[PDB]
Amino acid sequence: MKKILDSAKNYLNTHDKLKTACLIALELPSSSGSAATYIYLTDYFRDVTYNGILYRSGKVKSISSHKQNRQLSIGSLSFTITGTAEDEVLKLVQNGVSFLDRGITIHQAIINEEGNILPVDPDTDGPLLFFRGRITGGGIKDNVNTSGIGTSVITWNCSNQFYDFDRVNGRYTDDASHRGLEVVNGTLQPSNGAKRPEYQEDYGFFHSNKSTTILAKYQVKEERYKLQSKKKLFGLSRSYSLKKYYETVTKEVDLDFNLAAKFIPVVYGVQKIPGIPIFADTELNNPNIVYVVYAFAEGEIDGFLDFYIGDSPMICF
Amino acid sequence: TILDTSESVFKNVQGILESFGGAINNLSGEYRITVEKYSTNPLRINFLDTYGDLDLSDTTGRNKFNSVQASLVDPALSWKTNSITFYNSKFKEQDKGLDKKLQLS
Amino acid sequence: TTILAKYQVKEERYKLQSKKKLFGLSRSYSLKKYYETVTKEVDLDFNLAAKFIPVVYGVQKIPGIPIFADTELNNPNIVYVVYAFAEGEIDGFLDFYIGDSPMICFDETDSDTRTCFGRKKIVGDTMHRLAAGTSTSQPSVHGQEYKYNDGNGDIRIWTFHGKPDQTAAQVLVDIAKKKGFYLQNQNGNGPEYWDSRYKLLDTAYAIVRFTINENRTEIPEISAEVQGKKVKVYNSDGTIKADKTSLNGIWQLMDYLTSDRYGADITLDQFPLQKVISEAKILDIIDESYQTSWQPYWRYVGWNDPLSENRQIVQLNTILDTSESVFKNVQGILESFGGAINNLSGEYRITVEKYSTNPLRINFLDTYGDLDLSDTTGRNKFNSVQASLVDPALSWKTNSITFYNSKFKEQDKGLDKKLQLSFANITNYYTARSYADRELKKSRYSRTLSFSVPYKFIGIEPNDPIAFTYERYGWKDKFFLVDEVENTRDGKINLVLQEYGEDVFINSEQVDNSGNDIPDISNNVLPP
Amino acid sequence: ASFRDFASNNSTAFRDAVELALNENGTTLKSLGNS
Amino acid sequence: ASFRDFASNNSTAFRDAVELALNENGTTLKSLGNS
Amino acid sequence: ASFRDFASNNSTAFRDAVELALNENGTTLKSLGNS
Amino acid sequence: MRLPDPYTNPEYPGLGFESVNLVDNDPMIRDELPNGKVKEVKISAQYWGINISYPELFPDEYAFLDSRLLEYKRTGDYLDVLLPQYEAFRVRGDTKSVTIPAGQKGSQIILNTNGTLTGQPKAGDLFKLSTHPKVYKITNFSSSGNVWNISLYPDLFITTTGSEKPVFNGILFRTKLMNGDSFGSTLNNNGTYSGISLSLRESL
């Protein structure tokens, strides 16, 4: 329940003819990420000043309906510009320009008798928010009729942060991915692709490629290249059947053809997880003493409660 | 919880939810997390306050069950699976003794 | 299989390695599901799809399906077992994996762990070194016997290539003639147990003879590295060259499409030879990003002579699991080098993505007046790529190619978006890296255009260069590639263009991964 | 024709109408999240 | 609008019209019984 | 009625309209080639 | 080809337009902005449309007319028409010695008569270039001695190449029939074909 000022609760109950305007503020698609230019637009017939920002009129034509269910889904919205402005057309059809992560905020403003904005939102003492998200898509539709009236509509597509549902954001256990290596002139140099600028001089995952093969020498013929599945049970819903759901659950995965088994999990609370080797080597004069490094979990963990050397924990039940 | 990071962000969020209810909502600008609850002061809607349309739909079949069977990874066992099964005599006294089981994990 | 199981471990009793490990990551799969589906071994007692004969183009590792297994009469510990490798006339067998260790050891590191011959790294030694005794880098010889003794027992191979007119193996015929086979005498069969009729036409195989003794008490899993079926390479002048397998994707697809033995029977009549020949040279363009010296496993990536160029832009060493459907097999051969089979204008036309300096000029006034622009930057634009492939530098395991782009992340306000890929038919590391870079570049142009043109301009086909010029926009000869073309009977052509760029087809410089090979020198007992 | 735009404005109805003929037999469209 | 009721009265036609565009490629809707 | 013929003449639009409501959540129709 | 009319065939006075409708057809991408401003973009080419209505045609006149129309439909060429209301010969002289300097696009045009033409083309009259078959309409005129400045309603379809000659008289519209698919003629008991009409449309 988004609380509304009691002052607005009187206007929304007494007045029947409500003059509403939608204030749009979208970031300009720019070739580079430098600076942050904003185009401010409105659906009202006259320009509307909000927080000193002049939302110019005459461009926006229509806005779609924002629908939200109780199942996680992208919240799609579609607002259309006139398409005959010829100054908005070039911004959309410009070459070498990307708007992958450009945002947009839309306000729902109610105009008074004197032409001002009726305060509704208690925290801001201003208008409500209709939608705020990201720009994912776009298009223009030219329709030249050989006899009659033609139309052109520029439609911008909007959604929330989960627009790319097929996106795997994870720190794969590899040097090339951890430091964001990229060939610059003739060498693989760390770049800004790393999730942190301090990851550029982190060689922790340098020997992760040969760790499994070296470790396999000191294992049984079985379990030579294997690892337990990080998550055993994942959830039974209407997308599965009993037989299929309980047959899909696996115990161990082969590491020589499963690149998804080398991702670092994140654990909240007390849970049992396998360890992914990232280093394995013996001493020089004592070859039977082997150091092997296993990377458990991600982030600052509280600690390790117990270690299962084989299938038997060090602290007995 | 264990979040297999090799999964998609969308599916990971969808899996974190449905474990405690939850519904991420992007309406009114912010991201709002809402869970199912009971309140003693709900909002009163009369049908005369609506636009006149009304659609009632009760799909008792395929959605109404008399007993539940669930499973979980229980550290009481060696992190194996334990089954929780119980019946309800009232719900089977209703529905004319039909046997309908809810399967959960 | 049942007879062979007697001479195996309790595990691997009825098992066989999957013919194709990696098959291709597309929008039909997710990362977790795709990498969980990949299997290593299949049980032969309930998998009838594991007894189909695969077809191999180029140098690839495939398991052997047993088709015969029997011991000698007075020497019951000597067992003859016949494994059928691949289909068609193959160039030969490069190496044999007796267990998990090839007869020709990888390098110096693998030589000091077991009894081996030659080196597969730099030297590129082949199995024929066993018979010749010198440094030989060419495949086996049809019907020649090879002797391999690693110190634990004698093993003889008798490699047989596919041929339309194979004759029955003389060794097995000679053994069956004198009632030498044990189960032959057990069941009372005579010389017909193995006869001249046992020709095994159009199927390569090897008759590996095991001498089970005190040391090799079990028959290990047999796998081999074949060089692949010979294909017909058409030349512009008119001559026909079919003597060796070709790594070119178009020739492999043409062989798969014109074979009535395996696949669809599309006659060579329904094919424009000139167009296919011209399109093959597009995949034959020499890449100058890397150096030939940077690949030490030159012999086992399809190359035949390190002195030669061998730097084609797209090179494919493919395994086609024939148990798949013809439609899916063709769809999998494509999407490995681009490609689009087109049935318009009568013939079957193979078109690949390319850049041209003389595209066809379409002005918007030449259209029917309609125009639809659609750019789905979300879900299609990425800043970095991560790919995987089966690399013979490792023991045919999976190697990951990951690199970022600082320019694409300077754009898009530093958003982290990764492209996930998996190459099935590519084994060369540098070729896979180049293809991943091309895909990453091509993802930055996500904008399509649809319009209709009159009957004139007839002849437009997918993957054709077109320059669009609409003065209302800032467009003057904008490069586009045809994606959808529809022909109507009333002389109207509907088109859907896909935006491309010039930078898509230039190759960025890369470095050498020659020193990051990880041979699997495990799975064997180290000597004292 | 101009039917594409319309259908794109009523997609959920199409989804429901599809899932209503697959439920005749035991098929349903909620079995795609697995794949 | 009132299009939902109609589509709910012609569901099988929708199913067939859908399965007719998936058969263009090798996809078909009879592959949901497995899942 | 005669709606079947029509829908059979506009199948791709139906496919797209269906796939546009499944993309609301993480479902999509390109996940049938596996099965 | 030429559409028959009393000027070409005076022996058939039944031919000749009982009423001619010269419509203006300029498609435009008109958009009505929410602020009250109307924005229209011209992209599609403009074309004059001619609707000709004939009086009571006797059998021989209709035989000639439909013979000519069927020859049109057969050989597939264009059908020229001459509107008589715009046949006021307001400009005497021969226009061969009139030069139009090259490199001119848009409504405005400049032509030098070199002291040859006699008569001033007033606004509303027709104009047509020698090479291109498009027919324009003079909207304003202004002359400084011999040089004439003419403003035309449709923008010059082709840029003048320095050889195009003005045509101020005998302007023919290169039209195409739009009633060909179903064109019927009724014969009365009085002996005349009634309600013969044509919906022409300028091509290119």
Residues 15-34 of E with CB under 8 A from A: 34
User: Residue E25: its chain C contacts at CB < 8 A?
Assistant: 331
Neighbours, chain B (3 or more CB pairs < 8 A): A, C, F
Tokens of F19: 């796939």
Taking the CA atoms of A194, A195, A201 and A206 in sequence, report the sign of the dihedral they define.
negative
Measured in angstroms, the CA of D27 and the nearest CA of chain F are apart by 13
Report CB contact under 8 Å: A100, C375: no
User: Residue B7: its chain C contacts at CB < 8 A?
Assistant: 31-32
User: Residue D35: its chain C contacts at CB < 8 A?
Assistant: 28-30, 33
Tokens of C153: 């027992």
Q: How many CB pairs under 8 A join A and B?
A: 108
Tokens of E8: 């709910």
Q: How far apart are CA C223 and CA C17, in angstroms?
A: 9
| Three-class DSSP category at C191 | helix
Q: How far apart are CA G65 and CA A76, in angstroms?
A: 63
Q: Do chains A and B touch (3 or more CB pairs under 8 A)?
A: yes
User: Residue F12: its chain C contacts at CB < 8 A?
Assistant: none
Q: How far apart are CA C22 and CA A252, in angstroms?
A: 19
Report CB contact under 8 Å: G43, A46: no
Tokens of C185: 């005498």
Task: Output the CA angle C193-C197-C201, nearest 5 degrees.
Answer: 120
Taking the CA atoms of C184, C186, C190 and C193 in sequence, report the sign of the dihedral they define.
negative
Q: Which helix (H) or strand (E) holds A139?
A: strand A139-143
Q: Which of G30, G34, G35 sits opposite A149 (nearest CB)?
A: G30
Report CB contact under 8 Å: F24, A74: yes
How far from each other are the two terminal CA atoms of chain A, in whole angstroms?
48
Report CB contact under 8 Å: A139, C511: no
Resolution as reported, in Å: 3.5
Distance of CA A151 to the CA centre of its chain: 36
Give the CB-side neighbour count of residue A153, counting CA atoms within 13 A.
11
Q: How far apart are CA A277 and CA A290, in angstroms?
A: 13
User: Residue D3: its chain E contacts at CB < 8 A?
Assistant: none
Locate tokens 């204008």: which residue? Answer: C345
Q: Which of E7, E33, E35 sits opposite D17 (nearest CB)?
A: E7
C7, C218 contact by CB (below 8 A): yes
Measured in angstroms, the CA of B96 and the nearest CA of chain A are apart by 26
Neighbours, chain F (3 or more CB pairs < 8 A): A, B, C, D, E
DSSP label at C167? P
Q: How far apart are CA G174 and CA G72, in angstroms?
A: 12
Across F9-26, b (16+ Cβ under 10 Å) vs e yields ebbebbbbbbbbbbbbbb
**Count of residues for chain C?**
528
Q: How far apart are CA C108 and CA C88, in angstroms?
A: 35
Q: How far apart are CA G134 and CA C480, in angstroms?
A: 34
Determination technique for this PDB entry?
cryo-EM
Q: How far apart are CA G21 and CA G83, in angstroms?
A: 10
Distance of CA C422 to the CA centre of its chain: 13
Q: How far apart are CA C405 and CA C442, in angstroms?
A: 13
Q: How many CB pairs under 8 A join B and C?
A: 8
User: Residue G40: its chain A contacts at CB < 8 A?
Assistant: 84
Q: How far apart are CA C12 and CA C42, in angstroms?
A: 10
Choosing among C32, C388, C418, which should be mutated to test the B contact, i.e. which has the most B CBs within 10 A? C32
Q: How many CB pairs under 8 A join C and D?
A: 5
| Three-class DSSP category at C269 | helix
User: Residue C36: its chain A contacts at CB < 8 A?
Assistant: 250, 253, 258, 260
Tokens of G109: 């045009």
Q: Do chains A and E touch (3 or more CB pairs under 8 A)?
A: yes
Region for residue B22 given its phi and psi (left: phi exceeds 0; alpha: psi -120 to 50; beta: otherwise): left
Neighbours, chain C (3 or more CB pairs < 8 A): A, B, D, E, F, G
| Burial tier of A156 (Cβ tally within 10 Å: 0-12, 13-18, 19+) | buried
A146, C369 contact by CB (below 8 A): yes
Residues 344-373 of C with CB under 8 A from A: 369-373
C310, C292 contact by CB (below 8 A): yes
Q: How far apart are CA C481 and CA C499, in angstroms?
A: 6
- DSSP-assigned beta bridge partners for residue A159: A134
User: Residue C370: its chain A contacts at CB < 8 A?
Assistant: 142-144
Q: How many CB pairs under 8 A join A and G?
A: 56
Report CB contact under 8 Å: E17, F7: yes
Q: How far apart are CA C81 and CA A201, in angstroms?
A: 55
Measured in angstroms, the CA of C29 and the nearest CA of chain F are apart by 6
Report CB contact under 8 Å: E22, F8: no
Q: How far apart are CA C347 and CA C488, in angstroms?
A: 18
Locate tokens 């032969």: which residue? Answer: C44
Q: What are phi and psi of C330, to 5 degrees?
A: -65, -45
Tokens of B90: 């009232």
User: Residue A186: its chain C contacts at CB < 8 A?
Assistant: 509, 511
Q: How far apart are CA C421 and CA C423, in angstroms?
A: 7
| Closest C-alpha to C319, from C31, C144, C90, C26 | C90
H runs (alpha helix) in G46-132: 59-75
Q: How far apart are CA C255 and CA C251, in angstroms?
A: 6
Q: Which of A44, A46, A149 sits opposite G28 (nearest CB)?
A: A149
Tokens of C501: 């760029």
Measured in angstroms, the CA of C270 and the nearest CA of chain B are apart by 45
| Closest C-alpha to G52, from G203, G195, G204 | G195
Chain A interface with F: residues with Cβ < 8 Å: 69, 71-74, 76, 165-166
Which amino acid, B15?
G
Measured in angstroms, the CA of E10 and the nearest CA of chain F are apart by 8
Tokens of C344: 């318009």
Q: How far apart are CA G38 and CA C76, in angstroms?
A: 99
Report CB contact under 8 Å: F10, D3: yes
Q: What are phi and psi of A309, to 5 degrees?
A: -65, -50
- Nearest-CA residue of chain A relative to B30? A132
Q: What interhelical angle do D11-22 and E11-22 show, nearest 10? A: 100
User: Residue D34: its chain A contacts at CB < 8 A?
Assistant: 239-240, 244, 248
G128, G83 contact by CB (below 8 A): no
Tokens of C455: 């009957």
Q: Which of D3, D33, D35 sits opposite F13 (nearest CB)?
A: D3
